[PDB]
């Protein structure tokens, strides 16, 4: 009668950067979806929350990361932008829910919290659920960069620099994306 480790994901003291977003595989456990899902941004896709306690799934993937407030709208199916195309992409037929909450009291420092990073440049768009942690010098021109930060050769990652004095559109938001997978296999993650 193992209980699903949702506390470890939502109540983690430190979250991952969006470009290197973390995923927790949850399987073979009992979950209190209804009791854990009752100032939170909550959007579900392809499935209803009042019905999750009645469904079993093959695997439930828990993706967690941090973006700024103006970018939460991109964590959704069929969205475009720097976060959706280059950091964390959700498929068009995504079945799951997205949860976000303002974490300005946890992830913002007076001198600036430059620890959280995001990808700015990439040659192509990310596939759904793709994670690219490569930090190779991006070639924006014709000449080969060869690991040289120069003209048309820039570093592909930048910092959020979360400061508490910023506006809500620039304040940190911790995002937890729960994917509900139902392939073949046996259904082990049942709600109760």
């Amino acid at each position: 009668t193992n209980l699903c480790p949702f506390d470890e994901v939502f109540n983690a003291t430190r979250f991952a950067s969006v470009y290197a977003w973390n995923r927790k595989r949850i399987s073979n456990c009992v979950a209190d979806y209804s009791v854990l899902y009752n100032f939170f941004t909550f959007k579900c896709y392809g499935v209803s929350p009042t019905k999750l306690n009645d469904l079993c799934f093959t695997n439930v993937y828990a993706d967690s990361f941090v973006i700024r407030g103006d970018e939460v709208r991109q964590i959704a199916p069929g969205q475009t932008g720097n976060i959706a195309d280059y950091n964390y992409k959700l498929p068009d037929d995504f079945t799951g829910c997205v949860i976000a909450w303002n974490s300005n009291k946890l992830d913002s420092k007076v001198s600036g919290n430059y620890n959280y990073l995001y990808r700015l440049f990439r040659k192509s768009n990310l596939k759904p659920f793709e994670r690219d942690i490569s930090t190779e010098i991006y070639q924006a021109g014709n000449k080969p960069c060869n690991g040289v930060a120069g003209f048309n050769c820039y570093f592909p990652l930048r910092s959020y620099s979360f400061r508490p004095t910023y506006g809500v559109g620039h304040q940190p938001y911790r995002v937890v994306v729960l994917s509900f997978e139902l392939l073949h296999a046996p259904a082990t993650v049942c709600g109760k």
Epitope: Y45, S48, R73, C97
Partner: nanobody, 124 residues
């Protein structure tokens, strides 16, 4: 980008009926949770009703529960609001809204990406 156009509003006597309709652009209407909000002058947008993809969870604001019925016809890209036993307090601009996601916080305007311009309902 989805466009939404409400129709069926206008003047009606107390105790009367109106069916609001709202039609969406696109060929993926089935992928949208559809909702109705209303706004009386001086007040914020108040949640009225919402319908999930399958039609199967429907939701209602406290003050319209029992009097109003939301329904959808995917073949016509249309969501309907049947408003029965209308009272003067139902007078407002009625807004159609749509989102890919079904929200736990289904009464929050911020959970819906797409909004119609609204249509006046007046109950005398």
């Amino acid at each position: 980008q989805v466009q939404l156009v409400e129709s069926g509003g206008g003047l009606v006597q107390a105790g009367g009926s109106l069916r609001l309709a709202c039609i969406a652009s696109g060929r993926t209407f089935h992928s949208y949770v559809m909702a109705w909000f209303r706004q009386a002058p001086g007040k914020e947008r108040e949640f009225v009703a919402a319908i999930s993809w399958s039609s199967t969870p429907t939701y209602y604001g406290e003050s319209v529960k029992g009097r109003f019925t939301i329904s959808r016809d995917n073949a016509k890209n249309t969501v309907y609001l049947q408003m029965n036993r209308l009272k003067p307090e139902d007078t407002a601009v009625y807004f159609c809204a749509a989102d890919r996601g079904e929200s736990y916080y289904y009464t929050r305007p911020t959970e819906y990406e797409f909004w119609g311009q609204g249509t006046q309902v007046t109950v005398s």
